[PDB]
Amino acid sequence: TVYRDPSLTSAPITANVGKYVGPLSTFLASIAKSAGYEVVFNFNIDALALINGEIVFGNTTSYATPLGRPQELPAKPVVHNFSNAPFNEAWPLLMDVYELDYQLVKVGSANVIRIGQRPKQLALPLKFISAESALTAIEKFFGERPTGKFGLPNSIKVIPDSSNKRLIIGSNSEDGIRIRSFVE
Amino acid sequence: SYATPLGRPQELPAKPVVHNFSNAPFNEAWPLLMDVYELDYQLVKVGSANVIRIGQRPKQLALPLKFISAESALTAIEKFFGERPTGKFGLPNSIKVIPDSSNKRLIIGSNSEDGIRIRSFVE
Amino acid sequence: GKYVGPLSTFLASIAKSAGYEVVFNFNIDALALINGEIVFGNTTSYATPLGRPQELPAKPVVHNFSNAPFNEAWPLLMDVYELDYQLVKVGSA
């Protein structure tokens, strides 16, 4: 996949921010820099359940917690590195990592970008199951229903409401495994 | 002495971040690490540089049933693995079941008990 | 003003490498953000990997104008902050 916005400047940029916190995010994204790759994490990978010699015995305060840390799991690591990347195609990537939405405004000879927030809605067409039992099979798969998710029946489709991560591992991949030929 | 002869079951499903690689191909060493930690990746192009967008793997699995109805197979699972923990889900579909659990609990869990109860019923 | 978080500063700075003048409609630094400096210090690290949803609909007062016409720069600011204006005459002013 590629992100390109053919209405922005294509001049190259060069930036950097932040350092990884955990022992796993640093180990990864470093073995991949031995090859030519620029790993970007969609979630707080260091909030998993991780055990190590340094995690429990010190060496900071070892932000790893072998018990996990599920309340800080959907965070987003602000660590980026760009070298001569075109702003035309590097900007739309960042607006997809953080789920933002932008538009251009002219204040004369200067163009300004008005960053907002992306409307988190999605329409899921159903091909073989009624969207009244598909909701029921979602409320039990993903039940605990968390207030971060909404499922809207419409008898033709469903309209899930969730963050980007919960719209991939969530409905978009279970609703894709239960749309199949029913047997009689 | 992090051993505690009483056990430590709340910290049991942790993952040890200890690895050692020597001249291993990144082609085949990377997909291993994405299966140990249950991650999912995809490639993005930002021009002349390729960037990997690591995510999280959707933890779902379909288990075909050959000899038992998937309405009593669920009942025999809720009692085997009962305590049902919130880390596990079992979805009947009358043709199969759809377990939801971590990688470890999808091996010693349904995948090996459902494999021992799909057998020739006697009358 | 100056931006507070590490994300609002990183953005609106790579966009100034090109010619752009980023304006945020919300408190982008009240999201859930994790970093080496956020948790370990370096201030008190106003980022809070747990998020900060009560301070999310805030408005960053950070602006920069250079030879912009007041004719068309004023109506932009009255739309960022959702204000409404009208003109009154007190004589020659």
- Residue A31 in contact with residue B52, Cβ under 8 Å? no
Q: Strands B63-64, B15-16: parallel, antiparallel or unpaired by DSSP?
A: unpaired
Give me the amino acid identity at B115: G
Angle at A17 between CA A14 and CA A21, to 5 degrees: 145
Select the residue of B2, B19, B54 nearest A42 (Cβ to Cβ): B54
How far, in Å, are A130, A147, A162 from residue A157 at the CA level? 8, 21, 16
The β-bridge relationship of strands A40-41 and B50-54 is parallel
Tokens coding C88: 């009154």
CA separation, residue A70 to residues A44, A48, A49, A75, B34 (Å): 10, 7, 9, 10, 20
Task: State whether residue A104 is helix, strand or coil.
Answer: strand
Give the chain A residue nearest B14 (alpha carbons): A49
* Test mutation, A44, A78, A164, chain C, max C CBs within 10 A: A78
Pairing state between β C33-34 and A76-77: parallel
CB C5 within 8 A of CB C29: yes
**Bridge partners (DSSP) listed for residue A133:** none
**What is the DSSP-derived secondary structure letter of residue A74?**
T
Report yes or no: B63 and B116 within 8 Å, Cβ to Cβ: no
Q: Indicate yes or no: CB of A35 within 8 angstroms of CB of B26.
A: yes
Burial category of B75 from C-beta neighbours within 10 Å (exposed 0-12, middle 13-18, buried 19 and up):
exposed
Contacts of A154 (CB under 8 A, 6+ apart): A131
Alpha carbon distance C2, C62 (integer Å): 6
**Minimal Cβ distance to A108: which of C18, C20, C72:** C72
Q: Return d(Cα B58, Cα B101) in angstroms, integer.
A: 10
Closest CA relative to residue A90, chosen from A180, A15, A167, A184: A15
B86 to A144: CB separation less than 8 angstroms, yes or no: yes
Nearest-angstrom CA–CA distance, B3 and B11: 11
The structure was resolved to a resolution in Å of 2.6
In 10 A of CB A69, how many CB atoms? Answer: 19
- Determine which of C34, C50, C59 to mutate to test the interface with A (most A C-beta atoms within 10 Å): C34
The order of strands in the sheet holding B50-54 is: A40-41, B50-54, B43-45
Q: Which residues of B touch A67 (CB under 8 A)?
A: 10-11, 14
Quote the CA–CA distance of A165 and A144 in Å, as a whole number: 18
For this PDB entry, the determination method is cryo-EM
User: From CA A115, how far away is CA B6, in angstroms rounded?
Assistant: 54
Residues 6+ apart with CB under 8 A from A184: none
